[PDB]
Structure formats: structure tokens, C-alpha cells
């Protein structure tokens, strides 16, 4: 599994399901590519 959406990404450990959810830069957080 992953790291879910609302889930704080870490940009050198990005353990998110990408490109469906990831992290983002502006929310700081995994969340989904809207």
C-alpha cells in the first residue's frame, strides 16, 4: 500500500500511489492529481 491522500509527503520518501495520488507542493500533503 501507500500513503493515502491527506497524508503529509515527504518529497525524498514519496511513498504515495503516483501519478493518481502525489504529493503535492502546494498542499504539502499526497493528495489526488485534480
Known sequence: ???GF????????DKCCRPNLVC???DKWCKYQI
Do not use: F, M
Request: hydrophobic content about 20%.
Open 1 to 3: 500500500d501507500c500513503l
Open 6 to 13: 491527506l497524508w503529509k509527503c515527504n518529497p525524498s520518501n
Open 24 to 26: 503535492s507542493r502546494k
